[PDB]
Design a protein around this nucleic acid. Structure first.
Lengths: 129, 150, 50, 155, 100, 194, 84
RNA sequence: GUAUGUAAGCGUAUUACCGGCCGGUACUAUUACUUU
């Protein structure tokens, strides 16, 4: 059963560049997922992604540029306040230099350093580098 | 998938994209609203009501010519009976268990198959118990399997 | 006594709750042809002569 | 419910039939001084013109509602003027930052103006004085009480 | 007998009228307002005899229901036994022209 | 001498003159000897004449309880009006009664408890089918541009492709003027066997 | 190419033999046809995989062949792959 | 020239009133979550 519609969508992206699949056939077009792929394009991690919509769910095509290493996911959505976001950096990132964990607070979906300027505590969905 | 089974197998219909075609169909939603008053009054189940309109006339989809689901098309002219249709096939399939296994026992393969449709009632009927399509204090009893279907 | 509170619905007061539509669409299907009598009376008066 | 069935007599203490001599004629349409909680909660209309006695009633007894105020769900109602409600919450562990489904159970008292409360209705709760060995609360309002699926609908 | 003949009764219960007993069957057999008569195999023998002599004069048709009174009595939504039945009005069902 | 509104504009609005000028054009569309059993009661509510810089695009507010009969006449509504209102492209566009919940601190819904045909999808779905009316849409695809921007791919195989293809440039304007989504329209000749 | 750049625009004929379900959109191979049985004249529309015995109101010549797949009528049929 | 990360207008309970855009007052399905 499709338990979490978030995480299963993430991993097949990581199961593309290893054999070098420059494209991704992807399902099933949720609006929380559409709020997420542009964050990759907000730092230029993938290629062009497009979404056809059948009148059941929709499905996603994703091209890839090949700059990724691994996108990940913590499960389920742990609740994280402001004063303890830094714990989820060092356990999830290679360093403070690059990479981005991505949570979502009551204001929306963002980067952690974006959230470190927006200052509103929220829930982890995933991470990538 | 395939709950009571080993198989991963998958078989279903395939609905098309648009929601109006057949537009060439001169038939409206109104004569089929009489056809359910004509055919569905003869005791037919909501599935096989929807299969005679496909082959004969043939409307591809009544959901495209009319908005309501077909039980509501049963209800809005008054054809929803007391019992939901799909368990009514299961309980008939359940009552054939107490016709084969009443005399021809030792069929513990067949006696396995009682535990399915009793469970395939009791998980299923728990859903329809909630949805207020038949009231609670509806307990399936073993002698009732004859008279619920007949 | 609780069973019969809002029960002007069952036998006659289904249609005497559906009488809101029975006094509208039954008459006004013809009155629009009566509203358009300027090109209904003069329409068949032209085809009868020509 | 009651036709004053008691081996003694029951009456709300603090009122008397004063018949002829009176400052004016203060009929008040019934000789029953029904108070109100005034904490935003509307009074039930049946409480003012009630015949029930209920010395432990928060509206009509020697009670003023105190403490805090909460909501929840009710399970059992067999015992007299008293229902069995249930509340839910979570707990925060150290080892996992994870949660659990534990619960408490507080028995509570009812005035009969909330007659016919059943499983599993939804009932808010407010605190008062101790009644008898457990009961320090009182029912405030049948707020929702609606199970739209299994409990709250006729058949 | 068959499962399929049982379904022909299955729309009479929503539609058609009924006569249950010797007395309710033989009453409409006197006026002849009935059409189809049902006989289960465990009918007593003179009762298995006596009904069908009317049918030689009332010109009606009967059937030999191969089940028992316990199932035929529950093949009609009831729970008490059925040994004979006459459907005096086929409401919506198709026993009006069907042979077995 | 020149009758205008009050036959078709109820129950909508009496402004304006450009909605009034087509109402004098509507009464001379009654003289086509075939639509006169229908348009005597086919009413309008509003209109709009928004230009694409040089040419105008005419918006027609159908009230949609008559969209089952507005469709089969719509082949002849656009053609005779275009030669009378050249070069201003006309299309019926039913503005809906959008039921929102306002973007506030979870602002209160009631009344109008929002059936599901009355959400922001109607800004697309209830609008896109009426703009490309005779197109018979087969596929909508969502192209996502670089800076959070979007293109939508609207597909039509051959279903009267040879009469409305000169309006798809006009169709790109008014959809961005009514909804805002940037649109392109998809030709392909291949009868894709399904 | 296994590392292909175009999935939005595939070649048409391989999609026609891909599946009834696994395509880029959802549409079955089935359709409707307008069979005239050759011993008669009357027009009748029917599904491809009809799964149901059909005859006309007065013209019951053949009109179908009972199967699990599509109704394969040999020399007793006349129809078209067309929405009517 | 450019950028957009800024607020208002504009596809609408951007709440009702008295005030100088601007104070006071009519006056809101919940939780869990997080904010101070």
């Amino acid at each position: 059963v499709r338990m979490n519609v978030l995480a299963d969508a993430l991993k097949c992206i990581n199961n593309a560049e290893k054999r070098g699949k420059r494209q991704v056939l992807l399902r099933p077009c949720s609006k929380v997922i559409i709020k997420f792929l542009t964050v990759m394009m907000k730092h230029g991690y993938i290629g062009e992604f497009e979404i056809v919509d059948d009148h059941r769910s929709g499905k996603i095509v994703v091209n890839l540029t090949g700059r990724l290493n691994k996108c990940g996911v913590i499960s389920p959505r742990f609740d994280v306040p402001i004063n303890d976001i830094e714990k989820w950096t060092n356990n999830l990132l290679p360093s403070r230099q690059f990479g981005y964990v991505v949570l979502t607070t009551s204001g929306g979906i963002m980067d952690h350093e974006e959230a470190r300027r927006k200052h509103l505590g929220g829930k982890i969905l995933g991470f990538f580098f | 998938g395939r709950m009571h089974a080993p198989g991963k197998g998958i078989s279903q219909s395939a609905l098309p994209y648009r929601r109006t075609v057949p537009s060439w169909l001169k038939l409206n939603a109104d004569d089929v609203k009489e056809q359910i008053k004509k055919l569905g009054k003869k005791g037919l189940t909501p599935s096989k009501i929807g299969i005679i309109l496909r082959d004969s006339h043939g409307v591809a989809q009544v959901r495209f010519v009319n908005g309501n689901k077909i039980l509501r098309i049963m209800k809005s002219v008054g054809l929803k009976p007391d019992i939901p249709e799909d368990l009514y096939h299961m309980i008939k399939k359940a009552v054939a268990i107490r016709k084969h296994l009443e005399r021809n026992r030792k069929d513990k393969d067949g006696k396995f198959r009682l535990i399915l449709v009793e469970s395939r009632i009791h998980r299923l009927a728990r859903y329809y118990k909630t949805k207020s399509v038949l009231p609670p204090n509806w307990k399936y009893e073993s002698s009732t399997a004859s008279a619920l279907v007949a | 006594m609780l069973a019969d509170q809002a029960e002007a619905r069952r036998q006659k007061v289904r249609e005497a709750r559906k009488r809101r539509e029975e006094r509208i669409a039954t008459k006004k299907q013809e009155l629009i042809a009566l509203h358009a009598k300027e090109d209904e009376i003069a329409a068949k008066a032209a085809t009868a002569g020509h | 419910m009651a036709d004053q069935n008691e081996r003694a007599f029951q009456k709300q203490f603090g009122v008397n039939l004063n018949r002829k001599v009176k400052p004016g004629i203060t009929k008040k349409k019934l000789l029953r001084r029904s108070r109100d909680v005034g904490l935003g909660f509307k009074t039930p209309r049946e409480a003012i013109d009630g015949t029930y006695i209920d010395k432990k009633c928060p509206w009509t007894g020697d009670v003023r509602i105190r403490g805090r105020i909460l909501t929840g769900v009710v399970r059992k109602a067999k015992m007299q003027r008293t229902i069995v409600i249930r509340r839910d919450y979570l707990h925060f562990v150290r080892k996992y930052s994870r949660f659990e489904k534990r619960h408490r159970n507080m028995s509570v008292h009812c005035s009969p103006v909330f007659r016919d409360v059943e499983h599993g209705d939804i009932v808010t709760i407010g605190e008062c004085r101790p009644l008898s060995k457990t009961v320090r609360f009182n029912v405030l309002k049948v707020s929702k009480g609606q199970g739209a699926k299994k409990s709250f609908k006729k058949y | 007998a068959l499962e399929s003949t049982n379904a022909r009764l299955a729309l009479v219960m929503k539609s058609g009228k009924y006569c249950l007993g010797y007395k309710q069957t033989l009453k409409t057999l006197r006026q002849g307002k009935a059409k189809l008569v049902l006989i289960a195999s465990n009918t007593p023998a003179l009762r298995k005899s006596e009904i069908e002599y009317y049918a030689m004069l009332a010109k009606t048709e009967v059937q030999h229901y191969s089940g028992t009174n316990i199932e035929l009595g529950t093949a009609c939504g009831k729970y008490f036994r059925v040994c004979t039945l006459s459907i005096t009005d086929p409401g919506d069902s198709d026993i009006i022209r069907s042979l077995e | 001498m020149a009758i205008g509104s009050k036959i078709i504009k109820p129950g909508g609005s009496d402004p304006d003159d450009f909605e009034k000028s087509i109402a004098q054009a509507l009464v001379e569309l009654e003289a086509n000897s075939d639509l006169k059993p229908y348009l005597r009661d086919l009413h309008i509510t509003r209109a709009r004449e928004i230009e694409f810089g040089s040419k105008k695009a005419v918006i027609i507010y159908v009230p949609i309880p008559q969209q089952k009969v507005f469709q089969k006449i719509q082949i002849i509504l656009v053609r005779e009006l275009e030669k009378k209102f050249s070069g201003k492209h006309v299309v019926v566009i039913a503005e809906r009664k959008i039921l929102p919940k306002p973007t506030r601190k979870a602002r209160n819904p009631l009344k109008q408890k929002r059936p599901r045909s009355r959400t922001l999808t109607a800004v697309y779905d209830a609008i896109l089918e009426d703009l490309v009316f005779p197109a018979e849409i087969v596929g909508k695809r969502i192209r996502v541009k670089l800076d959070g921007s979007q293109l939508v791919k609207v597909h039509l195989d051959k279903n009267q492709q040879t009469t409305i293809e000169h309006k798809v440039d006009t169709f790109t304007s008014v959809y961005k003027k009514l909804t805002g989504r940037d649109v392109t329209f998809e030709f392909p000749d291949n009868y894709l066997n399904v | 190419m296994p590392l292909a750049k175009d999935l939005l625009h595939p070649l048409p004929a391989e999609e026609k033999r891909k599946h009834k379900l696994k395509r880029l959109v959802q549409h079955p191979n089935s359709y409707f046809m307008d069979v005239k049985c050759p011993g008669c004249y009357r027009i009748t529309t029917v599904f491809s995989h009809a799964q149901g015995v059909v005859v006309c109101a007065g013209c019951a010549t053949i009109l179908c062949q009972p199967t699990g797949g599509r109704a394969k009528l040999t020399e007793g049929c006349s129809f078209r792959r067309k929405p009517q």
